[PDB]
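Milestone 3.1: sequence recovery, worked example.
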């Protein structure tokens, strides 16, 4: 019998692992269990599974493991600060169709390819095109599905700055890690989700 055949069990194991990378696991388990925000809990469950995969992929790489524990610490911190109430920073950036799920997967693929083949100023140029041309439209689509309201230029402008700045830090962190094999492949989806969670709710 393997765990992977038992989704509820591997979900449990994943949450435990994630919350272990925060400052107080018990407090995290309390906030998660007491929350009634279904989308938010599902975003955290998804990140937790990805975090489990990254743990397994980074076990022989000290620096990648350090970065992993750094993102886990950030994401869990953001969970505690948020509180997972009715209105939450967790949940809104989840793909609501199979098409949107595919867009997210593809941009994660392209970002891996770019990091693998570039560094420095050229990585910065190419990752910036991905943020603007792939990440921002994904985010805009999530908002526009809410009330069928198209995004105003000011929201787009301010969201762009926030996401670009946060995505650039992640890319620079991956680049340094790289200079030091599924480490980056598993780190990318965590770092991107940690970016989305910074959009205020």
């Amino acid at each position: 019998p393997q765990l992977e055949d038992f989704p509820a069990l591997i979900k449990q194991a994943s949450l435990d692992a994630l919350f272990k990378c925060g400052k107080d696991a018990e407090a995290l388990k309390e906030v998660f269990t007491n929350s009634n925000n279904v989308a938010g809990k599902k975003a955290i469950m998804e990140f937790a599974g990805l975090f489990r995969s990254a743990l397994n992929a980074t076990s022989d790489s000290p620096e990648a493991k350090t970065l992993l524990m750094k993102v886990g610490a950030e994401y869990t911190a953001q969970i505690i600060k948020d509180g997972l109430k009715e209105k939450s920073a967790f949940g809104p950036w989840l793909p609501e169709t199979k098409k949107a799920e595919a867009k997210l997967e593809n941009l994660e693929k392209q970002l891996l390819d770019i990091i693998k083949n570039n560094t420095g100023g050229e990585l910065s140029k190419l990752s910036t095109n991905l943020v603007m041309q792939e990440v921002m439209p994904y985010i805009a689509s999530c908002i526009e599905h809410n009330f069928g309201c198209t995004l105003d230029p000011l929201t787009r402008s301010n969201l762009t700055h926030l996401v670009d700045k946060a995505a650039a830090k992640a890319v620079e962190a991956l680049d340094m890690c790289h200079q030091k094999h599924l480490e980056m492949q598993t780190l990318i989806p965590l770092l991107l989700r940690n970016v989305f969670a910074q959009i205020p709710a």
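Residues 1-201 form a domain with the SipA N-terminal domain-like fold (CATH 1.10.4150.10). Helices lie at 7-20, 25-34, 38-58, 62-82, 98-117, 120-147, 153-179, 183-196.
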